[PDB]
Amino acid sequence: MKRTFQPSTLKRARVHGFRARMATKNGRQVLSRRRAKGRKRLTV
Amino acid sequence: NQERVFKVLLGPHISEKATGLADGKSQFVFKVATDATKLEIKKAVESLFSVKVQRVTTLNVKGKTKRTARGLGKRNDWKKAYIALQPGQDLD
Amino acid sequence: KANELREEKSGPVTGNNISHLLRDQFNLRMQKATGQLGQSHLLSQVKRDIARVKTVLNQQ
RNA sequence: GAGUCGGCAAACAGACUUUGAUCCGGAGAUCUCUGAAUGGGGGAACCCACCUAGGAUAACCUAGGUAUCUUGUACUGAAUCCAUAGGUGCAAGAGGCGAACCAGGGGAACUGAAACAUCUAAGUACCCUGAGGAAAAGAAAUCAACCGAGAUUCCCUUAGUAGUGGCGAGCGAACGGGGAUUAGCCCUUAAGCUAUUUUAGCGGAACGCUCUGGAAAGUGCGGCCAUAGUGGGUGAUAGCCCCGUACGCGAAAGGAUCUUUGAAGUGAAAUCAAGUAGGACGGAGCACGAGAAACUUUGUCUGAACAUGGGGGGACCAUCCUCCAAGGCUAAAUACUACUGACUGACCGAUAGUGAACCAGUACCGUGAGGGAAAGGCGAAAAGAACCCCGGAGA
RNA sequence: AACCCACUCCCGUUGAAAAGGUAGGGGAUGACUUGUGGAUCGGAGUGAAAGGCUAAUCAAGCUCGGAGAUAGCUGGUUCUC
RNA sequence: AGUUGAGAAGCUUGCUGGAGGUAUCAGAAGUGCGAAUGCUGACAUGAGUAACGACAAUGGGUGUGAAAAACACCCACGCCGAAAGACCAAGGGUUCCUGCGCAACGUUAAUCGACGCAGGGUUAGUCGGUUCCUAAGGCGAGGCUGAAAAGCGUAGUCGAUGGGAAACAGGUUAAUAUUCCUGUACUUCUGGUUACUGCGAUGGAGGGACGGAGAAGGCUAGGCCAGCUUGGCGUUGGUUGUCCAAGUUUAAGGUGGUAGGCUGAAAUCUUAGGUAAAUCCGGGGUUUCAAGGCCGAGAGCUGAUGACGAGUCGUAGAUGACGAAGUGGUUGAUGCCAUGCUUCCAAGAAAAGCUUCUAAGCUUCAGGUAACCAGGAACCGUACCCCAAACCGACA
């Protein structure tokens, strides 16, 4: 039956994208923390 | 510009679908620069081969992806233009 | 070389020189795409020769 | 200074020899699109543009410009007569990021008390805002007793002492000694001043025969070096085979540090103090939980003397002592390490040491924040097995 | 009848399936079903109300810090004489 | 393997191994494991046991090959056919096609593959995007509010699942076509030219612009029948037949203004309204006339003398050329007219392009009006799957 994940690219970018994280103040701290660990991606 | 004409063409492409195309019609396949418009390769054919061409179509190719140990390999991607000449003046 | 090019020629004369070896760069990209280029040393040489004449123009 | 075309790794093609080719250091030129991202928007690495001066053929290209806020500075001018708001043009600055350190704003709970409400934990964790290479603090309305000491900051004692505390758990000074370091001055505002090292290099001493061995640095047998003898690595154990090790020279050119030096700030460089001191309820900080509670603070309400005054000496009062509050400026001793460079180890030796010696914050697991592995070794040298036979022309 | 839902029996329970299947059932022009896009969040939302749902987790999620929380309670504690 | 001590343990040697080891006596300890439903790799018993994923069936032949129940072709059986067929949207990300392979994968074998290595392969003025305008909602200069972070919101500018120009038919391919090719079309823009001429806003008006249910109709796609061409003469009993099989196709656009619907029209003066103005709309007065006018499927004619066509003829296996009939009668939709019509209460989106009005400006060049040749239409996505072995469920 209906599993709990139905994919879409327009909903993914507006919630978890870069311009969404960079807009707020918590999200810019999510960027610096995830960058300074050294991850390859930063924008899932 | 004085330049920018000697940049937008990177040679022919000849293969099974391009060999039969240039014989039955007059259409020649060039592996053009990575970002060029339909005007500025209409001019770079009239300047570098001295022939008149009626119209030009283009398309983009995605690079094929290899999967091996210790990496994924994305090959380079590239544009491609079919140059449809006049019925005379097949080019070189 | 570079000491040759600083002999004055001009802004225009060396400015004519660039449109010469862009032809020689064009013909070496056409022959490589086809089957006939053995002198692979020539192909990596005019890249280092266009760079010289652009240097002696953006400075004097 | 004779070889070279980066690493995981072959065959092509070629550049210079004795010097500028690789190769190392200084300075410059280019520097696509994203990102504070800043011409307007966006789903980060995309779309649509204007303006100006030039060039270009019914289709464009060069070259710059074009964000908001502060300050200033012109021009401009609403209801409104004047003239402020407001609007444009220009100049200068800021914005973002970074491990810890410092000062402020806000500030828990578990847990202790063998339960638990005061109290501890604790003004600790965390969250914001500033600034600096350190910051803050500092030049007596301070402490001592009738003797005297003269800024602050930091370590060692006084001392787990006087105190404080459901007088429970607990929390805990000062005075005085010993040290480190050794300056004091005054008006942002009556009337202000606020010469050496460093990034590249170069020279650098002394050994021969003889055995065994695949191969001598080892067995033998002698000699030499020394301001450099416990280094590395060379076919096995090398002061004397190779690279290095003790001293000097530096350096076109930059950098920094002390100087002269330039401006300006670094700033040597004048007074002084009104809604101020005190007071009354309500809170904080003082080791100090309304306690005989001094003193500093400030949310509400009030209010002085003119340095013939004033305020301090732990309720309070008289006598003595000692200092000038309501304006400012300051080096040194001090705290820290994301980043370097030398060195050193009664530190580890691939289930240890970083999560990570291996292409590791990777693979993978998650809508996300986030979590997060396993993985070293042929030989001195590829000399990495020509050729033959069975096999699918393979394994 | 499509379509949405889940009343009964049997099979399945190491399933084909971390909730299905084959037979039968109820609504089926409306207090309907549904596609795309948005809004509401942790002593806080939503709820024709069952303490139900909020990413297979819910009488108060998930993750990282305080934090090696506290355990008069269980389990274990390595060579000789 | 031997041997020595009360014990922890010590000592000497045979083989493998191929470069490090530590008397003695003192120090420093990450100092001694069988057990913690201990932790991480290896290997057992269960056990060559259960299972091998719907109870839509396969049986021969010929081929290739080292080897065919499963691969290819052939002949014959079965099964879905409101899907087990075609196509768009998501989503995926080269799985599509061809050479070369078969160790691993695929619940077995494989010469086969959505599997390895190497090449190839997506063509747009009109189809979807971008560009224009907006709904819910987001962000938000200035501005208020707040210990700090920040919160709310005006101008404004983003946000489709909606609203805004235009194309269809046939050929071609190992693999792409409404994109290339032939054929006939349509829309918008720029530069000249010519004949002239009141141009102008983001501001007014008009329009765009819409609910449920129901019923009259009118067409059309499609489907059958009957003719008509090309071929056939048999199942053994019958069948030159009033028989048998197959084929009888054709678009967008032009012209046309019908079924049917809505609607008074025209002149002329005037005006407390359209936040300014208006020659536009609104309101008022007179007069003349029966109504205009605006929408609108579809038929017919044309596109089309053309294409396509069973076939036939010229390794004729692949191709080159030729090519007959191409018509009438009926029955038709849940498909278009219909964004209509009537009825009922629960009273049924916005904004722009489009048409017109004028303000400032006006220099009436500019700007507009037709007519005309001349040219242009940028950039992204186009392969394959899509009730599925390619997407969501750890899996074919």
Tab-separated table of N, CA, C and O (backbone and C1' of nucleotides) in Angstrom, chain D residues 3-49:
chain	number	residue	atom	x	y	z
D	3	G	P	71.797	13.990	-15.998
D	3	G	O5'	70.370	13.387	-16.358
D	3	G	C5'	69.239	13.569	-15.514
D	3	G	C4'	68.503	14.843	-15.840
D	3	G	C3'	67.002	14.753	-16.056
D	3	G	O3'	66.239	14.658	-14.867
D	3	G	C1'	67.952	16.066	-17.747
D	4	U	P	64.824	13.883	-14.869
D	4	U	O5'	63.870	14.747	-15.810
D	4	U	C5'	63.301	15.957	-15.336
D	4	U	C4'	62.440	16.641	-16.368
D	4	U	C3'	61.171	15.923	-16.776
D	4	U	O3'	60.119	16.044	-15.839
D	4	U	C1'	62.263	16.739	-18.698
D	5	C	P	59.163	14.787	-15.548
D	5	C	O5'	57.773	15.197	-16.189
D	5	C	C5'	57.405	16.555	-16.318
D	5	C	C4'	56.540	16.768	-17.531
D	5	C	C3'	55.519	15.686	-17.829
D	5	C	O3'	54.365	15.779	-17.013
D	5	C	C1'	56.604	16.365	-19.827
D	6	G	P	53.564	14.461	-16.567
D	6	G	O5'	53.511	14.556	-14.981
D	6	G	C5'	54.462	15.314	-14.256
D	6	G	C4'	54.051	15.474	-12.817
D	6	G	C3'	53.501	14.231	-12.153
D	6	G	O3'	54.507	13.330	-11.735
D	6	G	C1'	52.116	16.070	-11.642
D	7	G	P	54.272	11.750	-11.858
D	7	G	O5'	53.112	11.441	-10.808
D	7	G	C5'	53.356	11.442	-9.409
D	7	G	C4'	52.128	11.039	-8.617
D	7	G	C3'	51.528	9.680	-8.921
D	7	G	O3'	52.227	8.603	-8.328
D	7	G	C1'	49.808	11.264	-8.818
D	8	C	P	52.275	7.180	-9.069
D	8	C	O5'	50.775	6.665	-9.024
D	8	C	C5'	50.240	6.159	-7.813
D	8	C	C4'	48.839	5.631	-7.981
D	8	C	C3'	48.635	4.571	-9.046
D	8	C	O3'	49.109	3.282	-8.708
D	8	C	C1'	46.915	6.164	-9.198
D	9	A	P	50.022	2.486	-9.764
D	9	A	O5'	50.726	3.638	-10.623
D	9	A	C5'	51.866	3.386	-11.450
D	9	A	C4'	51.465	2.828	-12.792
D	9	A	C3'	52.280	3.309	-14.017
D	9	A	O3'	52.473	2.233	-14.959
D	9	A	C1'	50.007	3.639	-14.391
D	10	A	P	53.804	2.166	-15.875
D	10	A	O5'	53.342	1.761	-17.359
D	10	A	C5'	54.312	1.586	-18.409
D	10	A	C4'	53.687	1.204	-19.741
D	10	A	C3'	54.406	1.648	-21.024
D	10	A	O3'	55.463	0.781	-21.428
D	10	A	C1'	52.107	2.181	-21.175
D	11	A	P	56.660	1.269	-22.408
D	11	A	O5'	55.956	1.755	-23.753
D	11	A	C5'	56.417	1.367	-25.044
D	11	A	C4'	55.342	1.627	-26.070
D	11	A	C3'	55.579	2.788	-27.036
D	11	A	O3'	56.352	2.452	-28.178
D	11	A	C1'	53.481	3.056	-26.026
D	12	C	P	57.131	3.593	-29.009
D	12	C	O5'	55.985	4.436	-29.724
D	12	C	C5'	56.152	5.824	-29.969
D	12	C	C4'	54.845	6.490	-30.316
D	12	C	C3'	54.960	7.859	-30.957
D	12	C	O3'	55.238	7.801	-32.342
D	12	C	C1'	53.350	7.938	-29.235
D	13	A	P	56.517	8.568	-32.934
D	13	A	O5'	56.338	10.070	-32.431
D	13	A	C5'	55.795	11.058	-33.292
D	13	A	C4'	55.227	12.228	-32.529
D	13	A	C3'	56.170	13.390	-32.263
D	13	A	O3'	56.302	14.261	-33.370
D	13	A	C1'	55.040	12.838	-30.278
D	14	G	P	57.727	14.438	-34.079
D	14	G	O5'	58.233	15.861	-33.590
D	14	G	C5'	59.321	15.977	-32.689
D	14	G	C4'	58.915	16.719	-31.442
D	14	G	C3'	59.973	17.600	-30.806
D	14	G	O3'	60.093	18.847	-31.468
D	14	G	C1'	58.851	16.346	-29.139
D	15	A	P	61.321	19.830	-31.154
D	15	A	O5'	60.786	20.758	-29.978
D	15	A	C5'	61.405	22.003	-29.700
D	15	A	C4'	61.321	22.345	-28.236
D	15	A	C3'	62.656	22.571	-27.542
D	15	A	O3'	63.122	23.896	-27.680
D	15	A	C1'	61.392	21.027	-26.300
D	16	C	P	64.694	24.190	-27.690
D	16	C	O5'	65.133	23.940	-26.185
D	16	C	C5'	65.427	25.027	-25.317
D	16	C	C4'	66.575	24.697	-24.400
D	16	C	C3'	67.968	24.808	-25.033
D	16	C	O3'	68.916	25.250	-24.069
D	16	C	C1'	67.614	22.609	-24.272
D	17	U	P	70.304	25.895	-24.552
D	17	U	O5'	71.380	24.764	-24.230
D	17	U	C5'	71.896	24.626	-22.918
D	17	U	C4'	73.071	23.680	-22.850
D	17	U	C3'	73.658	23.162	-24.167
D	17	U	O3'	74.741	23.911	-24.755
D	17	U	C1'	73.339	21.367	-22.583
D	18	U	P	74.952	25.524	-24.819
D	18	U	O5'	76.489	25.796	-24.439
D	18	U	C5'	77.272	25.002	-23.537
D	18	U	C4'	76.519	24.630	-22.289
D	18	U	C3'	76.377	25.622	-21.164
D	18	U	O3'	75.433	26.620	-21.490
D	18	U	C1'	76.477	23.373	-20.359
D	19	U	P	75.822	28.171	-21.619
D	19	U	O5'	74.491	28.906	-21.145
D	19	U	C5'	73.247	28.676	-21.809
D	19	U	C4'	72.263	27.900	-20.963
D	19	U	C3'	71.473	28.718	-19.957
D	19	U	O3'	70.277	28.025	-19.640
D	19	U	C1'	72.770	27.163	-18.814
D	20	G	P	69.197	27.641	-20.746
D	20	G	O5'	67.871	27.584	-19.875
D	20	G	C5'	67.902	27.965	-18.503
D	20	G	C4'	66.693	28.777	-18.159
D	20	G	C3'	66.338	29.832	-19.208
D	20	G	O3'	64.921	29.881	-19.366
D	20	G	C1'	66.537	30.852	-17.107
D	21	A	P	64.255	29.512	-20.783
D	21	A	O5'	64.310	27.921	-20.819
D	21	A	C5'	63.870	27.159	-19.709
D	21	A	C4'	63.671	25.722	-20.072
D	21	A	C3'	62.980	24.881	-19.030
D	21	A	O3'	61.587	25.097	-19.024
D	21	A	C1'	64.819	23.704	-19.894
D	22	U	P	60.899	25.961	-17.866
D	22	U	O5'	59.936	24.915	-17.172
D	22	U	C5'	60.356	24.228	-16.014
D	22	U	C4'	60.443	22.746	-16.240
D	22	U	C3'	60.249	21.915	-14.989
D	22	U	O3'	58.892	21.703	-14.648
D	22	U	C1'	62.206	21.208	-16.053
D	23	C	P	58.244	22.447	-13.379
D	23	C	O5'	59.392	22.429	-12.278
D	23	C	C5'	59.662	21.287	-11.478
D	23	C	C4'	60.898	21.510	-10.649
D	23	C	C3'	60.788	22.589	-9.598
D	23	C	O3'	60.080	22.164	-8.452
D	23	C	C1'	62.849	22.800	-10.735
D	24	C	P	58.841	23.029	-7.913
D	24	C	O5'	59.525	24.242	-7.163
D	24	C	C5'	59.465	24.316	-5.752
D	24	C	C4'	60.679	24.994	-5.183
D	24	C	C3'	60.518	26.459	-4.845
D	24	C	O3'	59.762	26.707	-3.678
D	24	C	C1'	62.532	26.167	-5.998
D	25	G	P	58.396	27.548	-3.797
D	25	G	O5'	58.847	29.049	-3.537
D	25	G	C5'	59.170	29.482	-2.229
D	25	G	C4'	60.072	30.682	-2.244
D	25	G	C3'	59.474	31.980	-2.730
D	25	G	O3'	58.594	32.606	-1.820
D	25	G	C1'	61.549	31.702	-3.738
D	26	G	P	57.263	33.302	-2.388
D	26	G	O5'	57.739	34.753	-2.829
D	26	G	C5'	58.348	35.625	-1.897
D	26	G	C4'	58.893	36.858	-2.562
D	26	G	C3'	57.896	37.700	-3.326
D	26	G	O3'	57.111	38.525	-2.491
D	26	G	C1'	59.822	37.410	-4.634
D	27	A	P	55.588	38.830	-2.877
D	27	A	O5'	55.685	39.590	-4.271
D	27	A	C5'	56.031	40.962	-4.304
D	27	A	C4'	56.085	41.517	-5.707
D	27	A	C3'	54.809	41.474	-6.521
D	27	A	O3'	53.869	42.466	-6.167
D	27	A	C1'	56.594	40.783	-7.860
D	28	G	P	52.300	42.185	-6.356
D	28	G	O5'	52.096	42.074	-7.936
D	28	G	C5'	51.907	43.242	-8.718
D	28	G	C4'	52.107	43.008	-10.198
D	28	G	C3'	50.917	42.507	-10.987
D	28	G	O3'	49.944	43.499	-11.232
D	28	G	C1'	52.844	41.355	-11.677
D	29	A	P	48.397	43.086	-11.292
D	29	A	O5'	48.250	42.417	-12.721
D	29	A	C5'	48.504	43.163	-13.900
D	29	A	C4'	48.416	42.289	-15.117
D	29	A	C3'	47.149	41.468	-15.231
D	29	A	O3'	46.031	42.191	-15.696
D	29	A	C1'	48.980	40.064	-15.572
D	30	U	P	44.610	41.941	-15.005
D	30	U	O5'	44.197	40.504	-15.534
D	30	U	C5'	43.880	40.330	-16.902
D	30	U	C4'	43.783	38.878	-17.277
D	30	U	C3'	42.563	38.132	-16.796
D	30	U	O3'	41.444	38.367	-17.621
D	30	U	C1'	44.507	36.803	-16.535
D	31	C	P	40.049	38.794	-16.975
D	31	C	O5'	39.824	37.750	-15.803
D	31	C	C5'	39.376	36.440	-16.092
D	31	C	C4'	39.638	35.487	-14.957
D	31	C	C3'	38.720	35.589	-13.764
D	31	C	O3'	37.463	34.989	-14.000
D	31	C	C1'	40.946	35.331	-13.037
D	32	U	P	36.132	35.711	-13.486
D	32	U	O5'	35.097	35.553	-14.682
D	32	U	C5'	35.474	34.927	-15.895
D	32	U	C4'	34.347	34.121	-16.489
D	32	U	C3'	33.191	33.812	-15.558
D	32	U	O3'	32.333	34.905	-15.211
D	32	U	C1'	33.880	31.809	-16.551
D	33	C	P	31.132	35.472	-16.114
D	33	C	O5'	29.953	34.445	-15.851
D	33	C	C5'	29.351	34.387	-14.572
D	33	C	C4'	28.707	33.054	-14.308
D	33	C	C3'	28.058	32.916	-12.948
D	33	C	O3'	26.784	33.518	-12.871
D	33	C	C1'	29.389	31.027	-13.359
D	34	U	P	26.293	34.108	-11.472
D	34	U	O5'	26.062	32.809	-10.608
D	34	U	C5'	25.730	32.913	-9.247
D	34	U	C4'	25.898	31.598	-8.559
D	34	U	C3'	25.919	31.678	-7.059
D	34	U	O3'	24.621	31.748	-6.524
D	34	U	C1'	27.688	30.324	-7.792
D	35	G	P	24.176	33.051	-5.722
D	35	G	O5'	25.111	33.030	-4.448
D	35	G	C5'	24.819	32.156	-3.372
D	35	G	C4'	26.010	31.953	-2.482
D	35	G	C3'	26.450	33.147	-1.677
D	35	G	O3'	25.694	33.283	-0.499
D	35	G	C1'	28.317	32.138	-2.683
D	36	A	P	24.702	34.517	-0.339
D	36	A	O5'	25.613	35.646	0.305
D	36	A	C5'	26.194	35.478	1.588
D	36	A	C4'	26.365	36.807	2.269
D	36	A	C3'	25.658	37.965	1.610
D	36	A	O3'	24.280	37.998	1.934
D	36	A	C1'	27.840	38.605	2.288
D	37	A	P	23.246	38.714	0.945
D	37	A	O5'	24.078	38.864	-0.395
D	37	A	C5'	23.706	38.178	-1.580
D	37	A	C4'	24.428	38.740	-2.771
D	37	A	C3'	24.240	37.980	-4.080
D	37	A	O3'	24.201	38.905	-5.164
D	37	A	C1'	26.520	38.136	-3.576
D	38	U	P	22.834	39.640	-5.575
D	38	U	O5'	22.920	41.015	-4.798
D	38	U	C5'	22.401	42.201	-5.362
D	38	U	C4'	23.427	43.300	-5.456
D	38	U	C3'	24.711	42.970	-6.216
D	38	U	O3'	25.153	44.130	-6.907
D	38	U	C1'	25.236	43.655	-4.034
D	39	G	P	25.240	44.144	-8.503
D	39	G	O5'	23.802	44.637	-8.956
D	39	G	C5'	23.298	45.899	-8.558
D	39	G	C4'	22.072	46.249	-9.348
D	39	G	C3'	20.871	45.354	-9.141
D	39	G	O3'	20.128	45.672	-7.983
D	39	G	C1'	21.213	45.664	-11.439
D	40	G	P	19.272	44.533	-7.254
D	40	G	O5'	18.053	44.277	-8.228
D	40	G	C5'	16.866	45.044	-8.153
D	40	G	C4'	15.746	44.317	-8.839
D	40	G	C3'	15.406	42.973	-8.245
D	40	G	O3'	14.623	43.049	-7.074
D	40	G	C1'	15.617	42.736	-10.566
D	41	G	P	14.631	41.814	-6.061
D	41	G	O5'	13.463	40.914	-6.627
D	41	G	C5'	13.506	39.518	-6.471
D	41	G	C4'	13.068	38.811	-7.717
D	41	G	C3'	13.163	37.312	-7.625
D	41	G	O3'	12.071	36.742	-6.942
D	41	G	C1'	14.196	38.016	-9.603
D	42	G	P	12.346	35.571	-5.898
D	42	G	O5'	12.054	34.265	-6.761
D	42	G	C5'	12.459	32.985	-6.314
D	42	G	C4'	13.175	32.219	-7.396
D	42	G	C3'	14.099	31.117	-6.907
D	42	G	O3'	13.412	29.904	-6.688
D	42	G	C1'	15.249	32.467	-8.454
D	43	G	P	12.835	29.527	-5.243
D	43	G	O5'	13.112	27.963	-5.130
D	43	G	C5'	14.104	27.449	-4.256
D	43	G	C4'	14.807	26.256	-4.853
D	43	G	C3'	16.119	26.582	-5.547
D	43	G	O3'	17.015	25.474	-5.455
D	43	G	C1'	14.667	25.608	-7.089
D	44	A	P	18.241	25.460	-4.422
D	44	A	O5'	19.505	25.957	-5.255
D	44	A	C5'	19.607	27.315	-5.638
D	44	A	C4'	20.977	27.751	-6.070
D	44	A	C3'	21.687	26.962	-7.142
D	44	A	O3'	21.145	27.255	-8.422
D	44	A	C1'	23.191	27.891	-5.528
D	45	A	P	21.287	26.251	-9.667
D	45	A	O5'	22.753	26.498	-10.206
D	45	A	C5'	23.073	27.649	-10.966
D	45	A	C4'	24.560	27.805	-11.018
D	45	A	C3'	25.287	26.773	-11.855
D	45	A	O3'	25.391	27.174	-13.211
D	45	A	C1'	26.268	26.889	-9.708
D	46	C	P	24.550	26.451	-14.372
D	46	C	O5'	23.134	27.168	-14.362
D	46	C	C5'	22.666	27.888	-15.495
D	46	C	C4'	21.225	28.276	-15.303
D	46	C	C3'	20.745	29.516	-16.034
D	46	C	O3'	20.397	29.269	-17.381
D	46	C	C1'	20.065	29.618	-13.777
D	47	C	P	20.501	30.434	-18.483
D	47	C	O5'	19.251	31.378	-18.196
D	47	C	C5'	17.954	31.028	-18.647
D	47	C	C4'	16.899	31.957	-18.103
D	47	C	C3'	16.914	33.379	-18.634
D	47	C	O3'	16.262	33.511	-19.884
D	47	C	C1'	16.726	33.419	-16.283
D	48	C	P	16.740	34.620	-20.941
D	48	C	O5'	16.193	35.992	-20.359
D	48	C	C5'	14.812	36.306	-20.414
D	48	C	C4'	14.504	37.550	-19.623
D	48	C	C3'	15.169	38.823	-20.102
D	48	C	O3'	14.558	39.429	-21.221
D	48	C	C1'	15.463	38.645	-17.788
D	49	A	P	15.488	40.048	-22.374
D	49	A	O5'	15.835	41.515	-21.869
D	49	A	C5'	17.094	41.812	-21.278
D	49	A	C4'	16.917	42.649	-20.037
D	49	A	C3'	17.137	44.137	-20.166
D	49	A	O3'	16.055	44.786	-20.800
D	49	A	C1'	18.006	43.331	-18.104
